[PDB]
Amino acid sequence: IPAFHPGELNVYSAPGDVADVSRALRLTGRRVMLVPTMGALHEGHLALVRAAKRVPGSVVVVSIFVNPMQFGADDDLAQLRAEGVEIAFTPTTAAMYPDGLRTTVQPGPLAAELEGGPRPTHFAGVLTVVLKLLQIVRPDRVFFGEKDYQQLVLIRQLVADFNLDVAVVGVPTVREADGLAMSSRNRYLDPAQRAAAVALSAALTAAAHAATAGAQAALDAARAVLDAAPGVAVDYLELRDIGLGPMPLNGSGRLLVAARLGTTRLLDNIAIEIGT
Amino acid sequence: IPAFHPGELNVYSAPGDVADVSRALRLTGRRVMLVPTMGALHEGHLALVRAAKRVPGSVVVVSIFVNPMQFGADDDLAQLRAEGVEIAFTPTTAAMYPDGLRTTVQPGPLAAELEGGPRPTHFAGVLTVVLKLLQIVRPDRVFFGEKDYQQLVLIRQLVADFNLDVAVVGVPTVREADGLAMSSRNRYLDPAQRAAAVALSAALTAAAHAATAGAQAALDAARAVLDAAPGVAVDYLELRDIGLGPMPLNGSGRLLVAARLGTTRLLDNIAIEIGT
């Protein structure tokens, strides 16, 4: 078994090393929490880590892995060490795909909708990677941000559909003071674009309050705010049930927006209570 | 937690009940062994159970589940009780597919070859089911017969590719006295067909000895025996490496045959050492 130093950051890149250390730790009664990331960490990620750390005695494992592009489609560790993360898992593509793209996960039809429209193989990559990380780490709980809501829903589907014995924990989106959802993509915005980008959260929050007057009022309010914003080009604005099926006549839903500011595509979403 | 009576047969049909009992047993140090089946048990299956039972203290879980047909495509429990099996898992289709065919496993290209030629979605069903059973039961070891060799190879691929922490144990084919590989399909043969069916094992065993004289001699020997047999129609006869890639010039391989006797399709395969 590889060395593990309790209460310090331990970095591993071989799947077998993490698997072995995780198994040893779990046997002592320490629950293992997994926070999957693609690196370029910001406060939104630190919130996932802090949610994991609230579980007493937990060993928090943060993975950093950028999934390769499918056909036709740095102070990270220092930040983790400062949060008291004990395990960072940083595998290479070759370690994750030693046999190339061979067995993979085929998501349900939700993967072809919304973010899957522009990128029809994206969620197959995501669910394949997440499934592997879950089997390597065998966490008790795995933490995902609500900012990528469709991703979170699809992970819940993966866990239900393959009978995975892990709790999926969705953590609320961390926002800038003006409401902008944090994302590594925000780094690409110039100051004028960054100012205009507040329109996504403004539109969604306006919709969530407009929703006392019903679903059409909510959608129209959000659209009006987006239409008021300079150089925000809307890709989609959809109201769905909380599992991303069709919106119910009356009840709980989720409103999702995707919009482009110059070359940068941003997403946001919010809980909606229709007629409440 | 559901009742479990040690040293007796316990039958469960809910995935959650097996998951809970298996987890409780594993915590006591009893290793859990899984033997997946489609019921209609014969001695070939009992061999898998006996291999599982050889692991000291093991709780043997035998699943019986017939995977539904995809588009365009009884004394079992008494036998298990007599073998000292403590858990039989007999889920309904609805319990296994409560959300229909949603997330599934997409096998690698080997699934389109050999048995996947006639049935291109068969192994996706097999690997989806096996993945689920592995996550429900969380066994230390899972046992499969070598008779369905391509299935065994594909399961090894599933386990490697998704980083599953389970040992896959292939058990040699159990044969009738004349060499015929046991299979529930043998029940469909009339006496004349049953007698002619010895040709598959005869052809493969002849090939395994002919192989001292090389790969062509082995294939030609097997073909000659099949061609001598009345009302045996050969679907394929292929020599491959042990992972079912291309045969090596000199070395270890596997010879696989599929043939029809009237309406019944039978399979067999054997280890080949080329030039040995």
Swiss-Prot record, chains A, B:
(R)-pantoate binds at Q70, Q151. Subcutaneous immunization with the double panD and panC bacterial disruption mutant protects mice for over a year against subsequent virulent M.tuberculosis (strain Erdman) infections; mice show mild lung inflammation and fibrosis despite a chronic bacterila infection. This is a promising attenuated vaccine strain. Keywords: Acetylation, ATP-binding, Cytoplasm, Ligase, Magnesium, Metal-binding, Nucleotide-binding, Pantothenate biosynthesis, Virulence. Disruption phenotype: Simultaneous disruption of panD and panC gives a mutant unable to grow in the absence of panothenate. The double mutant has a highly attenuated disease response in BALB/c and SCID mice; immunocompromised BALB/c SCID mice survive on average 36 weeks as opposed to 5 weeks for mice infected with wild-type bacteria, while immunocompetent BALB/c mice survive indefinitely. In wild-type mice bacteria grow for 3 weeks then undergo a steady decline, bacteria persist over 8 months in SCID mice. Changing H42A: More than 1000-fold reduction in activity and 52-fold decrease in adenylate formation. The keyword Acetylation applies. One of its GO terms (biological process) is beta-alanine metabolic process. Its main location: cytoplasm. Its EC number is 6.3.2.1. Pantothenate exhibits uncompetitive inhibition toward both D-pantoate and ATP, and non-competitive inhibition toward beta-alanine. AMPCPP exhibits competitive inhibition toward ATP, uncompetitive inhibition toward beta-alanine, and non-competitive inhibition toward D-pantoate. The enzyme is most active in the presence of magnesium or manganese. Other divalent cations (cobalt, nickel, zinc) are less effective. Beta-alanine binds at Q70. It holds the Pfam family Pantoate_ligase. ATP binds at residues 38-45, 145-148, 174, 182-185. Pathway: Cofactor biosynthesis; (R)-pantothenate biosynthesis; (R)-pantothenate from (R)-pantoate and beta-alanine: step 1/1. The active site is at H45 (proton donor). HAMAP family: PanC. Catalyzes the condensation of pantoate with beta-alanine in an ATP-dependent reaction via a pantoyl-adenylate intermediate. NCBIfam families: panC. Belongs to the pantothenate synthetase family. This is Pantothenate synthetase. The gene is panC.
